[PDB]
Amino acid sequence: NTKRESGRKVQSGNINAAKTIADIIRTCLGPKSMMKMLLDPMGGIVMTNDGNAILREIQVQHPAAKSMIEISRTQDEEVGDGTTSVIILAGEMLSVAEHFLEQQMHPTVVISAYRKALDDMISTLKKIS
Amino acid sequence: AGFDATNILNKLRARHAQGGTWYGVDINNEDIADNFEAFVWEPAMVRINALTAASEAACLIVSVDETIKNPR
Amino acid sequence: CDDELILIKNTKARTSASIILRGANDFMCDEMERSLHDALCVVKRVLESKSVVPGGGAVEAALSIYLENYATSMGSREQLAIAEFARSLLVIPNTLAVNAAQDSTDLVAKLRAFHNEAQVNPERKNLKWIGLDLSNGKPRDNKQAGVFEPTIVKVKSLKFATEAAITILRIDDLIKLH
Amino acid sequence: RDKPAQIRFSNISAAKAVADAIRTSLGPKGMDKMIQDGKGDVTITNDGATILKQMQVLHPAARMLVELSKAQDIEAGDGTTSVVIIAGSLLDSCTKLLQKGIHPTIISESFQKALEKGIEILTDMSRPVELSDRETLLNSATTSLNSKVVSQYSSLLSPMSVNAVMKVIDPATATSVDLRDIKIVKKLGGTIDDCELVEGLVLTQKVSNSGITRVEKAKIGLIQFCLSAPKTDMDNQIVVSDYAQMDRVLREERAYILNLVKQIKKTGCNVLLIQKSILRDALSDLALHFLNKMKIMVIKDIEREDIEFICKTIGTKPVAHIDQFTADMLGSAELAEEVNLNGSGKLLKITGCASPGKTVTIVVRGSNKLVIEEAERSIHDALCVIRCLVKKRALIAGGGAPEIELALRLTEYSRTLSGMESYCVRAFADAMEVIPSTLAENAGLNPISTVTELRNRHAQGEKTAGINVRKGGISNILEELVVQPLLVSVSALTLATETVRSILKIDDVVNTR
Amino acid sequence: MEGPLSVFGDRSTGETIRSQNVMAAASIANIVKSSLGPVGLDKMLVDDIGDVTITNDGATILKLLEVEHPAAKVLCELADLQDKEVGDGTTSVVIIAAELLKNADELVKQKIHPTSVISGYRLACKEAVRYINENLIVNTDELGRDCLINAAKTSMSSKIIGINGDFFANMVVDAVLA
């Protein structure tokens, strides 16, 4: 109908649900690991090494709670790893860069930034691979 | 003058795309035309005066969005 | 590439070419092909029209103060009428370059740098650059880029611009229905 | 007590705001109404001349104005808002005069005295123009048609309106060329270009398919007779339980009726308008297609329109069962013509017939009924404004403009009466300046430029003239080609005078249970 | 809406239904502004808690949008019908279309007679029609330095991922001329 939502506030909505997923499975990631407990409304114990598994089993928000499953499922389809890593990088970086940059007023040079911090990343990686 | 401002004002603008010597809306005649030839007569000195005020009288506080007051 | 095509050499009913895009992967060709189609299309859009208009609002933001002064030209309620639109040829770039986060008040600074009393001129030439390249947010001197649009697509929107306006007027007698 | 005043005030209140929300009128003013109803239903409405009738309002005086909205539309067909725009112009003085020490009775003849003197002066500003003049027909249609739906097809409709009236014209400055007379029929297909003036009677019926008569030699329809057959009007003791005996009944029923329809074609009938009643089934679907085997144009459940016009024009009555044959009460018909233009539409055209010196039947066509109604309501109101000029031969200022001329001059008669109602006249004599400034109402920003001028624009023009409300520019309100016969405006004043004068007698609290 | 809320259906009784339309026109235009073109950011359009879509297209959102305002009504079709025209002006019409119906009825109401103000939003567009059709000035692909080749190139070099405009300065020529 007639409704308008705005930018950095929607970006924050993109920040919020993802920022939560960026944490536990980041702790669950790697040789220092954890479990993500899920309280069922009846009290049933659920803990996994995948928070998207916890998300599928509980409320998922239309913001990146939906997407950080999606793009990790995208990450799950391809190499079959890093889904735990994708959730914790994306919402983090979106929680990191945006505010510092949008107070400088731009997604724009941030638009270029991710593929530039991807560039050397991809670059020296293959080089020190 | 009983006039609508804007149309009259826009006329005067057109009238200053046509004329523009003294032309203006004069409640003196309640018309739109040359003022100085309408016997709208005041020295040009007060203009600079008012215009020294006009732009500058506004720029004082807009130079201040942080305004401190004290009881003392 | 491990990709085979059957080459028909010297097709004698009419000439032909099948151009093989070399990617290291097939989706490299689409990045080409997406660059190609619009390049194909914009040239085809120049195959649509000889007269062709710059992308971006340096077309509009020119007439803006041209025709918002043309408001004054007729004056009266028309100086109101003509300005209301001709004040609004300012706003599209204010959306355009700001979508690139250029603060189009800086763009209209550059736009109306082109837009002059000395240059009122669409001409066919540039003594003012009327191009605004929307892959940037500020004018670039490309006139062959794929972002620009033909004169067919625009004079259309000119009706559409005025179409939201008087379409809603002709009603009489506002009422209530139970 | 207090009961009379309040609701009578509310009669002046609730109806006024409705009548105040009225005037956006004459063209591009305001913004469109996409109307969530009081029930929530969403509806788009434009050109409030029609929206008046369309408007759904409750409350006693407020719904009165929609019923008063047709009052201008019912007889005239031109400037339908003229009574509704002044429906609040009387309610203007109503409050004051009730509050002025003036009795609702003294306010009652006040409307009259203001009505009496008002329509008087309007005659002076009515320029009499020839009742049969092609122009005063064409241009009355045109000016209307210019305001009505089609401004291009006007050039088609206006002469067809003229030609439809000039056929039925009973040249007079009194009532002539009625609406019952001119028969306006709609046909899917063709074009408004192919909207055809037809002098002869054209019945619009549902004709079964084609392979039927477009040709001459037809005895006209409007028949009520059923076809008596076994298993129709005739006794069959053949019992139906088993499927075979249930099969034996329809076959004698179907095999017999085809002789009946031959007897119907034997009457000379290529057309039957069949009664919407059923004597049993009346004519069955066996009978109807057997009628279509004889090339007899047949509509079961025919409209009431082609029942009365065939009585009005062709002079037709039902004929008996075709075994009993006919009394030949079917009127004279010759060409039974179904126009198929791209096959669209079923249209019964009787070219030559009994006719009452009247009833042009104009076939209104188009790609769709919407395109048709573009012409139909336009040609109707074109006929109407012509009919209005046949009713009253004159053209006055259109769009409510002359009431402001009538405003100043009725203020003079406010002095000439010198009565208690002369004040009442005075209050309302200045309440007719409201419409032109108020027509500008609803559109936009920086408003006031329109208001006192349209008041003064006649005032400054003395008692002569002011700007046109529908055209624009300083000129004579009267001679524009925004022009309506004197009828339309003297109608409006006469109409709002009474219903609003009823308010004065509306009193206490009384409700039928 | 705004104004009297007890009579539904675009009777707000006065400019309340004009302004609620122009503020909706402005509001319905607020959708497309930050959506304008590719620089206009892709919107993530919630179709339901479980249904979304991501588009910056001006005519894509508004086909999905509901508009019960008359000025919001005329704006969606204008994004759509100009899309139906081309697809240039899905976004373009929307911005000023909020303004011109806001710009039109204001003086139309002021009437010396409403016919005067109608052209003011046509006239400048007409004066834009000429100016727009007066443009060969930018967008001309047929007139390059390399002609079609740079018409390829600069249009490729606009969307350039790479050596687009090198071998692809050839291809858009090769493709249209094959």
Q: Is the dihedral of CA B47, B53, B59, B62 positive or negative?
A: negative
Pair E55, E47: CB distance under 8 Å: no
Please give the angle made by the CA atoms of C8, C13 and C14, to the nearest 5 degrees: 80
Phi (first) and psi of residue A121, to 5 degrees:
-50, -65
Are the Cβ atoms of E139 and C149 closer than 8 angstroms?
yes
Find chain E residues with C-beta within 8 A of D471's C-beta. 113
* The two structure tokens encoding residue A112: 């270029």
Breaks (C-N over 2.5 A) in chain A follow: none
Interior/surface letters C128-142, b for 16+ CB within 10 angstroms, e for the rest: bbbbbbbbbbbbbeb
How far apart CA D419 and CA D118 sit, in angstroms, is: 16
Q: Establish whether A51 is an annotated binding residue.
A: no
Q: Which two tokens stand for residue C112?
A: 């109306």
- Nearest chain E residue (CA) to D441: E109
H or E element: which one contains E155?
helix E148-156
CA angle C12, C15, C19 (to 5 degrees): 125
Chains A and E form CB pairs within 8 A to the count of: 24
Residue D204 CA to residue C105 CA, distance in Å, equals 66
- Residue in chain A closest to C136 (alpha carbons) equals A108
Query: What is the rounded distance in angstroms from the CA atom of residue D20 to the CA atom of residue D87?
Result: 9
* Pairwise CA distance, residues D494 & D501, whole Å: 11
How distant is the Cα of C81 from the closest Cα of chain B, in angstroms? 10
**Known catalytic residue: D43?**
no
Side-chain half-sphere exposure of B57, counting CA atoms within 13 A: 7
DSSP code string of E26-92: HHHHHHHHTTSTTTSPPEEEEEETTEEEEE--HHHHHHHS---SHHHHHHHHHHHHHHHHTSTTTTH
**One-letter amino acid of D313:** T
Q: Are the C-beta atoms of residues D388 and D140 closer than 8 Å to each other?
A: yes
Task: Specify whether the CB–CB gap between C149 and C53 falls below 8 A.
Answer: yes
A-chain CB neighbours of E65 within 8 Å are 1-2
Q: How many Å apart are CA C46 and CA D459, to the nearest integer?
A: 60
Question: Do the beta carbons of residue D204 and residue D310 sit within 8 Å?
Answer: no
Q: Which of D381, D411, D494, D499 is catalytic?
A: D381
Q: Is D235 a catalytic residue?
A: no
> From the candidates D80, D204, D361, D497, which is the catalytic residue?
D80
Closest residue by Cα to residue C167 from D472, D374, D34: D34
C-alpha–C-alpha distance, residues E31 and E109, integer Å = 28
Token pair for D73: 């539309």
| Intra-chain end-to-end CA distance of chain B, in Å | 49
Provide the Cα torsion D127, D131, D134, D138; round to 10°.
60
Chains contacting A with at least 3 CB pairs below 8 Å?
Answer: C, E
Provide the token pair at A94. 């979106």
Taking an 8 Å cut-off on Cβ atoms, the answer to whether D29 and E109 are in contact is: yes
Tell me the two tokens of residue D85.
């725009």
Contact with chain C for residue D472, Cβ under 8 A: no
D190: Cα separation from own chain's centroid: 23
CB distance A2–E65 less than 8 Å?
yes
For residue E80, list chain C residues with Cβ-Cβ distance below 8 A: none
The two tokens of residue D475 are 């000129």
From the list D495, D483, D478, the residue with the least C-alpha distance to D121 is D478
Token code pair at residue D96:
């004051």
d(CA D161, CA A123): 84
Encoded tokens for D82: 């003229």
| List of residues 6+ apart from D506 with CB closer than 8 A | D4, D7, D8, D11, D60, D61
Chain C residues with CB-CB distance to A105 below 8 A: 101
Tokens 């529908």 map to which residue? Answer: D470
| CA-based R_g, chain D, Å | 28
Q: Give residue ranges of E with CB < 8 Å to any A CB.
A: 24, 27-28, 30-31, 34, 41, 44, 46, 49, 52, 65-69, 72
Going from the C-alpha of D476 to that of each of D78, D396, D401, D464, D469, the distances in angstroms are: 20, 10, 10, 7, 11
Residue D56 contacts by C-beta under 8 Å, 6 or more apart in sequence?
C176, C177, C178, D37, D38, D66
C131 closest CA partner among E74, E154, D142: E154
Classify residue C22 by burial, with Cβ atoms within 10 Å: 0-12, 13-18, 19+. Answer: exposed
DSSP letter for E13, please: S
Q: Measured between CA atoms, how close is A106 to chain C, in angstroms?
A: 6
Residue A63 is which amino acid? P
* Residues 6+ positions from C170 with CB-CB distance below 8 Å: D27, D28, D32, D46, D47
DSSP for D16-83, written as a single string: HHHHHHH---SSS-S--EEEE-TT--EEEE-SHHHHHHH----SHHHHHHHHHHHHHHHHT-S-TTHH
**Residue D64 to residue B40: CA distance in whole angstroms:** 58
Chains contacting E (3+ CB pairs below 8 angstroms):
A, C, D
Q: How far apart are CA D258 and CA A14, in angstroms?
A: 79
Contact E100, C14 (CB under 8 A): no
* CB D110 within 8 Å of CB D418: no
Q: What is the DSSP letter of D347?
A: -
Interface contact flag, D24 C166, Cβ < 8 Å = no
- E70/chain D closest Cα distance in angstroms: 6
Cα–Cα nearest to D81, from D49, D53, D112? D49
Q: Which amino acid does the sequence have at B7?
A: N
Closest to E128 measured CA to CA, from C92, C17, A76, D280? C92
> Which two tokens mark A23?
């944490």
**Distance (Å, rounded) from C-alpha D146 to C-alpha D141?**
8
Chain D residues touching E108 at Cβ < 8 A:
28-29, 443-444
Q: Is E58 annotated as a binding residue?
A: no
Experimental technique of record: cryo-EM
User: Cα dist. C43→C124, C134, C151, E155 in Å?
Assistant: 18, 17, 13, 8
How far apart CA D110 and CA D504 sit, in angstroms, is: 11
Residues 6+ apart with CB under 8 A from A38: A45, A46, A47, A48, A54, A57, A58
How far is it, in rounded angstroms, from Cα A75 to Cα C163? 48
Contact list, C169 vs chain D (CB under 8 Å): 27-31, 443
- In chain E, residues with a C-beta closer than 8 Å to the C-beta of D30 are 18, 105, 109
Q: What is the DSSP string of D123-177?
A: HHT-B---SS-HHHHHHHHHHHHHHSS-SSTHHHHHHHHHHHHHHH---SSSS-S
CB C161 within 8 A of CB E14: no
Is C174 in contact with D33 (Cβ distance < 8 A)? yes
- Has D326 been annotated as catalytic? no
Chains that touch B (3 or more CB pairs under 8 A): C, D
The tokens of A114 are what?
């991710």
Tokens of E76: 């969606």
Min Cα separation C70/chain B (Å): 9
- Between the CA of residue D7 and those of A96, D130, D507, what are the distances in Å? 68, 47, 8
> Is residue D80 annotated as a catalytic residue, yes or no?
yes
Vertex C101, ends C100 and C106: CA angle to 5°? 105
Tokens (6 digits) for E151? 């018409």
Expressed in Å, this structure's resolution amounts to 8.7
Distance CA A84, CA A29 (A): 6
* Torsion angle defined by CA atoms of residues C131, C135, C137 and C139, in that order, rounded to the nearest 10 degrees: -20
For residues D264 and D328, give the distance between their C-alpha atoms in angstroms, rounded to a whole number: 11
**What are the DSSP E strand ranges found in B1-72?**
23-26, 31-34
Q: Count of residues for chain B?
A: 72
What is the rounded distance in angstroms from the CA atom of residue D84 to the CA atom of residue D53?
Answer: 10
Whole-angstrom distance, CA of residue A55 vs CA of residue A48: 11
Distance of alpha carbon D436 from its chain centroid, rounded? 25
The residues pairing with E52 across neighbouring beta strands, listed in sequence order, are: E46
Chain E: closest CA distance from residue D389 (Å): 27
B10 Cβ contact partners less than 8 Å away, ≥ 6 residues apart: C71, C72, C75, C76, C77, C78, C79, C80
Which listed residue (D81, D143, D359, D497) is catalytic? D81
Tokens read off for A61: 């928000």
How far apart CA D34 and CA D27 sit, in angstroms, is 17
**Using an 8 Å Cβ cutoff, are C93 and C132 in contact?**
yes
Spatial separation of the C-alpha atoms in residues D36 and D45, rounded to whole Å: 11
Residue written as token pair 């019945």: D203
Q: Directed axis angle between helix D104-124 and helix D402-417, to 10°?
A: 120
B17 touches chain C (CB under 8 A): yes
Q: How far apart are CA D462 and CA E4, in angstroms?
A: 40
- Which H or E element spans position E172? helix E168-177
Contacts of D295 (CB under 8 A, 6+ apart): D211, D212, D213, D265, D270
Distance CA C103, CA C80 (A): 27
Nearest CA to D205 among D223, D186, D192?
A: D186
Q: Distance (Å, rounded) from C-alpha C69 to C-alpha B28?
A: 29
DSSP D348-396: EEEEEE---S---EEEE-BSSHHHHHHHHHHHHHHHHHHHHHHHS--BE
